[PDB]
Amino acid sequence: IPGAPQPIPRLFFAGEHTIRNYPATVHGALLSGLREAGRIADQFLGAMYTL
Amino acid sequence: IPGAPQPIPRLFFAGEHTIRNYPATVHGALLSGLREAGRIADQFLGAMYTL
Amino acid sequence: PSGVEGAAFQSRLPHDRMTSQEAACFPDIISGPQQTQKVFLFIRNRTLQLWLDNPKIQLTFEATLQQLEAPYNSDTVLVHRVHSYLERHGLINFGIYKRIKPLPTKKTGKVIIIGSGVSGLAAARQLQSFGMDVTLLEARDRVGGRVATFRKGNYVADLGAMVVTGLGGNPMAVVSKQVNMELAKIKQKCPLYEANGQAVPKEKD
Amino acid sequence: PSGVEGAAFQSRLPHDRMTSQEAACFPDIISGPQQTQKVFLFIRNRTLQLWL
RNA sequence: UUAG
Ligand SMILES: Cc1cc2nc3c(=O)[nH]c(=O)nc-3n(C[C@H](O)[C@H](O)[C@H](O)COP(=O)(O)OP(=O)(O)OC[C@H]3O[C@@H](n4cnc5c(N)ncnc54)[C@H](O)[C@@H]3O)c2cc1C
Ligand SMILES: Cc1cc2nc3c(=O)[nH]c(=O)nc-3n(C[C@H](O)[C@H](O)[C@H](O)COP(=O)(O)OP(=O)(O)OC[C@H]3O[C@@H](n4cnc5c(N)ncnc54)[C@H](O)[C@@H]3O)c2cc1C
């Protein structure tokens, strides 16, 4: 809608190639997964622990 | 919609009675106004300065 | 309070420490080395000084960077971040100033403000500056709310707010520089009179 | 790494400092007195230990 | 304002 506000994201990225400190690894893929799961939940379910 | 995510707020509060450190004043009303203007803009326009 | 240490004082901010609100928006900096935090705090205090020295016009990001001396005007993204933070939280570019960067014709978001007292009016100006569509709903036939001035002829009498309770750290200090505010000091000389009408002796008061 | 100092190590976290990510979610604490930050870091390190 |  022209002139509306767009605060939230929709497309998230995880995987081995998305983690700066642990690329090209299984544990790095693992951690990228946990990261976005937390970011998605933060953004859609709200982060109550930050108040 | 049942089962949907509700991340954003809709009802904000300002005015003399909403500011802890400067209640019952004009400057306190003034500051409460600037606070919510920044919070509303943060939430609807997104805060680019936090990345 | 003088120089940049005073700009922080006038903005109700500690000049040698980052605040909770600043930590939230600049978590990278406050969690890191103390040297960087000093660089942040100087840019913050300096930018406030620039605005406070001339609050009658918009302080742009460009105008801020050129008024800065090295090494500080070298890290331009940090300066931009700090500027937008202050701009957004209403520490600079608030009130009534002559706009440099004009408003975008295309707006984003619609906000209804209930009441055009000072809190409503202040928020509206800010949201308008950020490019949002703002409309105020006011029950009275006037703005100001509990700021209610009686006028007849050139006589004036405030039935609402009347006193500015100090200018040291008061955002009304900035507003008074932007407005036709003719402030006047208050002689704290205050004689009493008992019900009978006779003045109260000095020593007793 | 042993005790709570090791729980932090095993979680790739500094045991005596708050991280950028922690500052973001607990800005009240990190901007405040160092005593409180120690209380935070112990609870963090201790909770990690329990899980681990 | 048949809010965009
Ligand atoms: C030969 C080899 C040896 C390795 N050895 C080690 C090692 O010794 N130690 C170590 O730590 N790491 C090692 N790795 C790296 C590790 O395997 C990977 O980094 C990790 O498994 C990747 O996890 P990921 O979820 O990010 O990617 P992926 O495991 O590739 O997950 C991506 C998924 O998406 C699927 N997919 C692709 N396209 C589509 C599509 N259009 N539609 C739907 N699904 C699609 C894929 O089939 C796949 O299942 C090795 C990798 C290779 C290739
Ligand atoms: C007698 C008096 C003296 C004062 N003296 C001082 C002083 O000396 N120094 C100082 O610092 N402060 C002083 N104050 C306080 C100061 O005036 C107020 O705190 C400040 O003006 C309030 O700003 P506000 O926007 O929060 O509230 P308001 O100014 O009341 O704004 C609220 C607006 O909402 C309107 N409204 C109400 N109901 C509705 C409705 N259903 N629909 C639509 N609109 C509605 C109201 O008409 C009003 O315009 C004084 C207050 C009073 C009452």
Side-chain angles (χ1 to χ4, degrees), chain A residues 14-18 22-30 32:
Chain A
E16 155 265 314
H17 57 286
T18 62
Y22 308 85
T25 55
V26 165
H27 53 87
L30 194 288
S32 71

Side-chain angles (χ1 to χ4, degrees), chain C residues 33-195:
Chain C
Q34 261 262 294
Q35 193 52 50
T36 311
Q37 304 184 19
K38 287 193 240 286
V39 184
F40 169 88
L41 291 164
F42 178 71
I43 298 169
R44 179 252 268 157
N45 296 332
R46 179 69 176 124
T47 311
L48 292 166
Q49 183 183 23
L50 296 169
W51 161 247
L52 285 166
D53 286 346
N54 190 20
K56 279 171 138 297
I57 71 164
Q58 188 192 349
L59 179 70
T60 68
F61 162 65
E62 292 83 6
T64 304
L65 199 53
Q66 63 185 25
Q67 281 255 335
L68 269 160
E69 278 264 15
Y72 299 119
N73 71 336
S74 306
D75 194 335
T76 71
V77 290
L78 179 69
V79 172
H80 185 201
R81 282 178 82 194
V82 163
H83 177 271
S84 297
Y85 167 89
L86 298 175
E87 205 174 35
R88 179 57 63 82
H89 291 240
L91 286 157
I92 61 159
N93 293 325
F94 72 85
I96 313 174
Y97 47 94
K98 219 66 203 60
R99 225 164 305 116
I100 294 175
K101 292 185 171 75
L103 308 168
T105 286
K106 53 180 175 184
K107 290 164 171 28
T108 302
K110 179 75 194 182
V111 186
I112 290 294
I113 300 174
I114 304 176
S116 59
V118 168
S119 70
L121 282 163
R125 278 207 142 245
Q126 286 293 104
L127 289 174
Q128 198 188 54
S129 282
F130 302 162
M132 304 195 78
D133 190 350
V134 179
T135 285
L136 294 104
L137 308 186
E138 171 57 48
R140 301 170 181 281
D141 55 325
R142 60 166 189 85
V143 296
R146 280 173 275 183
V147 173
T149 297
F150 173 78
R151 289 183 200 272
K152 194 157 178 168
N154 43 340
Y155 295 176
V156 157
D158 267 290
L159 300 169
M162 186 163 50
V163 185
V164 184
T165 56
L167 295 181
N170 193 330
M172 297 306 306
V174 175
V175 177
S176 58
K177 296 185 206 132
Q178 298 171 335
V179 181
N180 315 328
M181 274 187 109
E182 186 176 50
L183 300 174
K185 260 158 168 167
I186 298 171
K187 310 187 201 141
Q188 293 293 326
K189 179 60 136 190
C190 187
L192 312 195
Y193 299 82
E194 306 175 44

Side-chain angles (χ1 to χ4, degrees), chain D:
Chain D
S2 66
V4 303
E5 298 193 6
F9 169 84
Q10 178 59 15
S11 291
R12 306 157 300 282
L13 285 166
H15 64 94
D16 57 16
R17 197 198 348 129
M18 298 180 77
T19 65
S20 190
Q21 190 148 109
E22 286 168 332
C25 305
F26 301 84
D28 52 289
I29 280 157
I30 193 170
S31 71
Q34 261 262 294
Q35 193 52 50
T36 311
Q37 304 184 19
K38 287 193 240 286
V39 184
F40 169 88
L41 291 164
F42 178 71
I43 298 169
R44 179 252 268 157
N45 296 332
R46 179 69 176 124
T47 311
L48 292 166
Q49 183 183 23
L50 296 169
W51 161 247
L52 285 166

